[PDB]
Amino acid sequence: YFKIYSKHTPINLVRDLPQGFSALEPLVDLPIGINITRFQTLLALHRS
Amino acid sequence: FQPTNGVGYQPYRVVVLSFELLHAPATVCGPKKSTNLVKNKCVNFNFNG
Ligand SMILES: *[C@@H]1O[C@H](CO)[C@@H](O)[C@H](O)[C@H]1NC(C)=O
C-alpha cells in the first residue's frame, strides 16, 4: 500500500519551517505493490 | 470471410479475459451489491468490510 498524506498550510515566514501544529490528512492510497528504496524530487525550470 | 459461408467458416470475435492474482492489492473488483439501509432496529451491519 502506498499511503500519501498531505496538508496545505498558509504561512508567511521567509526562510525556515514555522513552529506550530498541523495534522496531515490522508489524501490517497495507491495499490502499487512494488519495491521502493530511493526517491528524487522533480522541479521545474524557468526559461527566458 | 463471406456472408454466405457456413457457421464453421463465419467470423467469430473472441475476447479472452485473463484474471491473475498478484501480491499487490487487488483493485479490479466486482460490483458490491448494497442492501437498502434500515434504521432504528438491531441489525447486522457490514459497512466497507
Ligand atoms: C527491495 O530493494 C532492495 C534494494 O534494491 C533489496 O535489497 C531488497 O531485497 C528488495 N526487496 C524485495 C522484496 O525485492
Side-chain angles (χ1 to χ4, degrees):
Chain A
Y1 292 164
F2 187 56
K3 267 81 69 176
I4 307 190
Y5 304 85
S6 187
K7 174 56 70 176
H8 209 181
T9 299
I11 62 168
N12 210 34
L13 199 149
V14 183
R15 186 174 173 86
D16 210 0
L17 278 168
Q19 186 178 13
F21 199 89
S22 65
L24 269 76
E25 298 167 72
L27 262 294
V28 57
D29 194 0
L30 277 301
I32 56 157
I34 61 170
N35 190 1
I36 288 161
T37 55
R38 288 162 67 193
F39 65 99
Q40 173 169 34
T41 320
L42 288 179
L43 290 172
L45 301 181
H46 272 217
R47 303 268 193 175
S48 65
Chain B
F1 287 143
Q2 284 85 17
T4 60
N5 288 348
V7 294
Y9 283 78
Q10 272 171 15
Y12 275 65
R13 294 182 163 190
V14 179
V15 172
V16 178
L17 308 167
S18 175
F19 305 124
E20 69 277 14
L21 193 144
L22 190 144
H23 291 173
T27 185
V28 181
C29 295
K32 297 127 302 182
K33 313 299 169 54
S34 290
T35 290
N36 296 354
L37 178 70
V38 174
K39 286 176 285 196
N40 280 293
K41 288 180 70 174
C42 172
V43 301
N44 295 295
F45 61 94
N46 198 325
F47 294 164
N48 295 347

